[PDB]
Amino acid sequence: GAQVSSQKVGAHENSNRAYGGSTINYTTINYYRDSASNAASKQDFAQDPSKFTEPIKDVLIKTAPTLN
Amino acid sequence: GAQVSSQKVGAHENSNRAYGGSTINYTTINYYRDSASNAASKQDFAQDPSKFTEPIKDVLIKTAPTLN
Amino acid sequence: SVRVMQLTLGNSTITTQEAANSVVAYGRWPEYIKDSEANPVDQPTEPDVAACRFYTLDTVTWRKESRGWWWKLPDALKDMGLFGQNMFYHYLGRAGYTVHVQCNASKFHQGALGVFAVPEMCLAGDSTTHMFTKYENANPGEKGGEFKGSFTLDTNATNPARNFCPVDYLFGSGVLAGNAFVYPHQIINLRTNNCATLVLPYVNSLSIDSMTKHNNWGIAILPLAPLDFATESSTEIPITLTIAPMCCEFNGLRNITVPRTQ
Amino acid sequence: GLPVLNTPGSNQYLTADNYQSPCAIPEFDVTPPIDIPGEVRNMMELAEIDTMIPLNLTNQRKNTMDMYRVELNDAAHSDTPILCLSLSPASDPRLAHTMLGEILNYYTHWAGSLKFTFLFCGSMMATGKLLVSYAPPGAEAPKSRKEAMLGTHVIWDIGLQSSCTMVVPWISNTTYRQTINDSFTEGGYISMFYQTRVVVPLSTPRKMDILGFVSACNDFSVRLLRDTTHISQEA
Amino acid sequence: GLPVLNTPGSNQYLTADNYQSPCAIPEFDVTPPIDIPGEVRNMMELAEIDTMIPLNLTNQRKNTMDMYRVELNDAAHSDTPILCLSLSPASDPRLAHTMLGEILNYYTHWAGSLKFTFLFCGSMMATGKLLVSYAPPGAEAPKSRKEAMLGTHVIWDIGLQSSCTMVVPWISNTTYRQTINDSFTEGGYISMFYQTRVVVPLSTPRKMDILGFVSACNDFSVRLLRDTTHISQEA
């Protein structure tokens, strides 16, 4: 039940282990039945800001005149 | 001897790990020989209340007249 | 074009020749409750055309000295035809809205109105007692309320007003008004447009709620650039508010609710 | 040995934890089970059994067998309620001590439909029609049959089938209600009225009792285990 | 048991750790989610929405609706600035309280491009051309249109399209700038001048306002979460 993800290496050691292998991976295993007990995975996604930045009914191009 | 079950995720993180993978599973291993030492699995079943709610000899339909 | 539109709901139609597009809040169009998100088990009532139509609330007048206006939904529509009837006869109710604010002037007038639709628009009170505003004052109906230029604490201990004291630059809630642009909005700049149109889906932490106890949306109108004309220190232009409920569905029918007033 | 790092929470005792521990009586020959009748798997099974409601909590009747009896009579038709109740299954004094109410007091939230069954204990010669009603919260509590009839109701005709069930559907704003009296999660009102009137011939008792029962429907659930106030211990 | 060795750091409590812990309310029936409109995934989404800038912080205008209004007039052409600002989005008093500035105050570093949009609120009969400018740090802050015109600038012609946007490109020595006033990571100057002049006919207001807005571009990012000075608590 182990989950193996890879790390985003910031500072690199003068090793090939700093660039590949299990040496740039980390392992995770959940010990509790309730999902609330789990830690945060932090592999979180993003989205389009459009719902806030452009909640416009008739879609407009920046090059084209906004007021038409 | 590890037992791998899946959790019933309540609050979901903005990750795909919150929806799949070993990240929504939990692992268990018994360390003691006596079953008394074990924790509760909590994967418990339910049953029909009929033995209490309808301990009637001649089965009756709700749509049909009870006193016949 | 971006400027000419026609909105038809039920037996009511609105036309405009000077629009600046329309905003659909959070990109969500109003909808009915899906079976997967349903809660109350009883068959809902959906008045449809009888309730989902354009209702014109009272016209307010904009002057050089105006600080702003506010309304609460569904509150402002509680006395509107069959929408109000269904609201009071049912324990639970849900609805989206099409808010159409109207304000025309001339090519020699200036001014800009910021029209904001705020989910859970909680306003600040007038006393040192927290959350002291009383039901009757929080729900003015179609006449709504007004913003003030400053905070004035109610000191009458014998007869507390138990009212709101929404200061304009503090957006009536202790936040800076310039940041209110994070909420769905449009601007009625007199040199550009006649109106502002906002389509609001139902927003809440529940699928359906009590319309009498809870106001889902708040409409705030603030003069971003004050009204000015030719050389007439004296200038008044009306601001009419027309709102239409959408996808109305009510649950929990019983005897009618008659709330306490004034 | 294997390098370890102690995380916060170490050496604590969570009363609701679920860990393993050594057995103090190892290799014990456990007595095998036998198939005993009446096994229970879920507490909700018990909440679905009809239990008699102590409807008459008047000073002379409360805490006696009379608290369970609601008397009717052959008087001319009246629009006044025979009984009134609030849908607060865990807190209303009339519901809080039924099997359903007892279980709800070990939990913080409840959700689902309920059903009230009434038994007519008059003679066979007695007839009558009654209106049982349920009004979702938010308006004035019904005080006449005219107001009650506008909400959920079942018109009970008395005859061979001695009982009548009225289902109080789950009509709520929140996904779960609280087991305490709280206006935010208020449930509504239950009331009964005479539709026509109880009619009896000569040589027949003019007053008789009806008994009420309450149980949970198959969509009923509770959550957040808590301690009940129904049991205490002094010193 | 299994031989272990406790490493330094054991039994400590790092406020920013990410470990598992036992659940105090096991088997709780969690209320499922509903699709509520307006969900947010990243704080940077909020920094990309135009927010009005309180440009006029003069003693009579600060902390009133007038702090947002910058007045223009039909006077003859002048080379003096209409407004001046420093590119310190988190620290300059005029930028520090915008939605962008508020978010930047919860982080120690910022990097990316910004854009300033100006709205003309004069009458339809009013015309004019304005020069909006951005001067990277290192030289004298522009005090005349002649100096401003030598840096990044957009000549705004007023007409149908009421607004004009000037993008302040990411021109920096360091890979990230600090959210505090620091010369090492200084950003430059923003200023506005009249290109020609505002012209209005008769029977038209000779003074009008313009409103400014600021938002982050799609290449904007912040790092190192810290506490803001924008909220305090006495006693």
Added chain:
Amino acid sequence: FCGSMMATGKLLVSYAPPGAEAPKSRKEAMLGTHVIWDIGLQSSCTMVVPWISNTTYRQT
């Protein structure tokens, strides 16, 4: 609309099927069939009075 080009305004044209009190305020009129006319380039506005009748034909 035969006003000058510099004139603007919004008007509400209404139609109320028979049976209730004839509308005397905009508040009553707005509850029936209506078209909100915005004055501008298109000089005219049309309001359709739909056939809403009990009988199949009305008398003249």
Added chain:
Amino acid sequence: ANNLPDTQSSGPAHSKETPALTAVETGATNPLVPSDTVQTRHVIQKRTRSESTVESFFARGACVAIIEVDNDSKLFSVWKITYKDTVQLRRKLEFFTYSRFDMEFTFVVTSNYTDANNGHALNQVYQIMYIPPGAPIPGKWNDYTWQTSSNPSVFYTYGAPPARISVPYVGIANAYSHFYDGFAKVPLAGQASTEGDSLYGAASLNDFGSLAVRVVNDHNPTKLTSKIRVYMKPKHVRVWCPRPPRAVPYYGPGVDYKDGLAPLPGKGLTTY
């Protein structure tokens, strides 16, 4: 939590496309990038928004309460659960209208002798009992309620690493409401003014219950005080409807204000 787009090189322009001009009246923000208004070079973007994700923004243990108990009724204390007793976490949560997450609670316990030269006591054990709305609240530091047969309790031994437990999403709605524009009651026509009156913006009178804390050891005449600092961290976070942050000082559980109403300093319009 990802990458940002590269800057593409952009040359001069002379066209009828004018991205610099716009109309903010529509309610939209102009999505310009540097190459729209200036000549740009190609830059391969390596910066990411990994730390500004909704999760990383809240992934910190914030203090929400400091419960105090004097082991010489103060032998035990009760804290009504809330996030509004402090200002820092509260302000961050209020950037949004609704939220849904799990919670991690860490308890830092400290104690000391009030007297520099008097008294002595053996190591203390604390009991932190959660009393869900409805459960009986302790009247004495040692009454029957502390048996916790159903309420979750945490027994902490002084000196041990801070205690820590996780709580699931416990709301009765589909999300937690940071703002509730309404009342718990509707006053009906005819009823006395005392009737149907409730607080504005308040839901349940007892939303989440409270914590009852006590020292389990028998109290000695020695003067001692203990403080339990409660730290809470939202994990597995989802938030809806952004709102402008609090600009003036908080004045209670509501959006009420009173004191610091003039937050901005003075600055010359033409002063850099």
